[PDB]
């Protein structure tokens, strides 16, 4: 099947069409992100279509969220009902408490998988990108070339096939 239209994309818009509550839509979107996005994804089976499928899931969550939430909540609460500012602050605080670059990447990557809009409001999320990215880079870019590749491969945990 094709690049821009295929059986798997088709299967997914059908499943997305069945979501009828903000909670089930938001849960499916979050589960999708844990299962199919970032180098930590649970599976690479949807590598060619996940980016587009995710966007379709986001549309459903967005639409349901705007209907469900009052104006203040649309601005300040996550799709799951959490206070965005509290999540932002606590996540950044964990990032700033990270003892090394390995703990740091897990916090940033995980934050993205769980709160990316339409879960967390964009204003809070991008403020998080601003703060989280800063610390991640400060930690990663310090003495960037000191670890030999043989050791860095082991730190990352790759299976070297060569």
């Amino acid at each position: 099947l094709g690049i821009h239209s295929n059986d798997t994309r088709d299967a997914w818009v059908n499943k997305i069409a069945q979501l009828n509550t903000l909670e089930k839509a938001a849960e499916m979107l979050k589960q999708f992100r844990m299962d199919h996005t970032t180098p930590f994804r649970n599976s690479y089976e949807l590598d060619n279509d996940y980016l587009w499928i995710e966007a379709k899931l986001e549309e459903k969550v967005a639409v349901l969220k705007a209907r469900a939430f009052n104006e203040v909540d649309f601005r300040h609460k996550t799709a799951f009902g959490e206070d965005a500012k509290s999540v932002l602050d606590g996540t950044v605080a964990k990032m700033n408490a990270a003892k090394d670059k390995w703990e740091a990447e897990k916090i940033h990557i995980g934050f993205r998988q769980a709160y990316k809009p339409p879960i967390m409001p964009v204003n809070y999320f991008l403020d998080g990108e601003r703060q989280l990215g800063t610390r991640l880079m400060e930690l990663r870019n310090l003495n960037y070339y000191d670890t030999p590749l043989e050791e860095l491969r082991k730190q990352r945990g790759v299976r070297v096939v060569h």
Partner: protein, 512 residues
């Protein structure tokens, strides 16, 4: 009548108070992640105001469009250009177009990063310049499509570019590298390295080769673009000056610079050499000579040397870059040609004079590349009735073609006269192929920044003609391919010629 001398106010007189325009408030800070602190009080070189900026650019436009619309059109300049160059310009103008475009967003980011009004103002002019450049490159393709010998590709590169592998690498250096990362790293990719090392000399060199090949359209536009570049160099220099007196600079600047340098050269070293030497009839200068002057001497030496007082030093990967350079462009054209059905331009095998030129300038060229091209011609690579695509030769001779997960540059280790290094890792259920130690470290350290799907992963198990068809790789007759393995006027390949070959893509890493 009246009394009082006619008087007015100029740009400098207003700019004198521009630094004072920004004011203090708690949240007056950049919205982007960065390890650096751009000093407020940082000044800019060009004392411009919006109105004077428009005036200076308008005069240039007047000249440019005047030439294009009047004399050059009367001279049929869009037609009287070598077929090979007409094709090269599809790639040169549209690929440069995306760099101009992403550079608008990059400088918007830099404008956001800067806290001093003058520094923001310097980046702002570049924001407007890059919009100008986007429209200029767009105009070059528009003109060649409107008045040239082959509009296909020139007329739809914005969508036909997506079929091929060379485009992915262009997005790395001139799109994503310009906007995704610490604002400073982006500035290094864009200004300090991209513009100062490659674009600035490239734009003028392009006018040289164009002129040699009968093209007077490109010099008219590109020479106008180059007049704005000085201000962009200043912006890059100012980026370093702005962050240099902060403790973060000593810790991070040189690694961001080294990473940006490697990033830019990894693509331009083989690609530009390829476009010049293989996309022209008349040659201006061998790329080995050009690269050494541009990167090693001009940039690597003099330009960077002017930044030493701010703690900047020569990229630690420069030596590696020079070593890998020599054969890089020759190695790449073999792949570009082998994969000709995936392009949006027409390619030619080097003719007898060129092969002689190549051998004279690169001893051993003929034994390796020359013989291969002769074999491909014998197999019928130019003829629609052969049922032969050079990719078939790669398969028959066990020569897998990989795509670097980081730079996106295609490489064939088992064949290459250059690098020949290959690193394959498996991580969390996916395999990744690297072509060098620098990009390998980038992925190992930042795997979440490099997840780009390659041509073989996306096209896996697909038959070639169906990919070309779905992605609109056809000319207006709806059957003849836009891309071709020769630049002659007939014996053009069609979709059906491709379909009969039954070429089905495979992900090469699966062999492991």
């Amino acid at each position: 009548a009246a009394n009082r001398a006619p008087t007015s106010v100029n740009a400098q007189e207003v700019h004198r108070w521009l630094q004072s325009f920004n004011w203090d408030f708690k949240n007056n800070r950049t919205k982007y992640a960065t390890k650096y602190k751009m000093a407020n009080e940082t000044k800019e070189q060009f004392k411009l105001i919006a109105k004077e900026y428009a005036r200076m650019e308008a005069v240039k436009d007047e000249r440019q469009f005047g030439s294009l619309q009047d004399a050059l059109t009367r001279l049929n300049a869009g037609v009287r250009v070598h077929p090979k160059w007409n094709e090269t310009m599809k790639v040169v103008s549209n690929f440069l177009e995306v760099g101009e475009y992403n550079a608008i967003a990059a400088t918007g980011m830099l404008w956001d990063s800067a806290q001093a009004a003058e520094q923001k103002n310097g980046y702002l002019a570049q924001v407007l310049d890059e919009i100008r450049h986007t429209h200029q490159c767009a105009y070059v393709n528009y003109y060649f499509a409107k008045n040239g010998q082959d509009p296909a590709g020139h007329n739809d590169a914005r969508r036909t570019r997506t079929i091929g592998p060379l485009w992915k690498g262009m997005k790395r250096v001139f799109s994503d590298g310009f906007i995704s990362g610490d604002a400073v790293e982006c500035s290094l990719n864009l200004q300090l390295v991209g513009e100062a090392c490659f674009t600035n000399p490239l734009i003028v060199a392009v006018t040289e080769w164009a002129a040699a090949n009968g093209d007077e359209i490109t010099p008219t536009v590109f020479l106008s673009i180059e007049t704005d570049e000085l201000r962009h160099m200043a912006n890059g220099y100012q980026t370093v000056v702005s962050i240099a007196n902060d403790p973060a600079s000593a810790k991070y600047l040189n690694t961001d610079l080294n990473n940006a340098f490697w990033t830019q050269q990894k693509y331009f070293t083989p690609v530009l050499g390829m476009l010049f030497e293989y996309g022209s009839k008349f040659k201006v200068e061998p790329w080995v000579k050009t690269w050494d002057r541009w990167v090693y001497e001009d940039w690597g030496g003099i330009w960077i040397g002017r930044l030493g007082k701010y703690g900047v030093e020569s990229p630690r990967s420069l030596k590696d870059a020079k070593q890998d350079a020599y054969w890089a462009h020759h190695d790449l054209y073999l792949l570009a040609y082998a994969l000709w059905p995936t392009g949006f331009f027409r390619l030619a095998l080097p003719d007898q004079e060129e092969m002689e030129w190549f051998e004279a300038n690169y001893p051993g060229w003929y034994d390796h590349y020359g013989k291969i091209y002769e074999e491909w011609r014998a197999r019928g690579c130019e003829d629609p009735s052969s049922g032969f695509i050079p990719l078939m030769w790669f398969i028959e001779n066990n020569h897998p073609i990989y795509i670097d997960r980081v730079s996106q540059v295609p490489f064939c280790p088992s064949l290459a006269k250059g690098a020949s290094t290959l690193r394959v890792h498996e991580y969390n259920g996916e395999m990744h192929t690297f072509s060098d130690q620098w990009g390998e470290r980038m992925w190992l350290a930042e795997p979440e920044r490099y997840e780009c799907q390659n041509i073989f992963e996306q096209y896996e198990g697909r038959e070639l003609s169906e990919v070309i068809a779905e992605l609109h790789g056809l000319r207006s007759d709806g059957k003849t391919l836009i891309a071709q393995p020769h630049v002659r006027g007939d014996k053009l390949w069609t979709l059906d010629d491709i379909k009969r070959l039954n070429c089905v893509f495979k992900n090469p890493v699966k062999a492991f």
